[PDB]
Amino acid sequence: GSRTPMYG
């Protein structure tokens, strides 16, 4: 899939 970005 389309990589989930991480908070911070």
Next chain:
Amino acid sequence: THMVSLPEELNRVRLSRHKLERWCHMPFFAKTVTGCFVRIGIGNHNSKPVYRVAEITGVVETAKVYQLGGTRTNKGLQLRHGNDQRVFRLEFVSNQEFTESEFMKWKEAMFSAGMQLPTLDEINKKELSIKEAL
């Protein structure tokens, strides 16, 4: 009366990022998503991504408009994890389902916080209301 106890159950009211994106300009986005859960990426540990279960308790405004998929938005989700309440941009919502470990962590965090778990019936009713609305 039976309480949620499996990830499969809670996944039923898990909203993916794709859905949030599809719906974020709809007129009753707030009403629909409030009460649903999400798998939220809260950061990295050892350069590995960490995710938590959290409930959506509301929709709020962020400081900046930001890019979300192919659109632009000012919307943030007010999210609850036990007693921890924080606002998150929609971009950090995962499209993957909860793992058992994430679920158990959430359960323990809910107990430690002295929070009531959702009942299976609340879950099923919420899900049903969404499936009917589409």
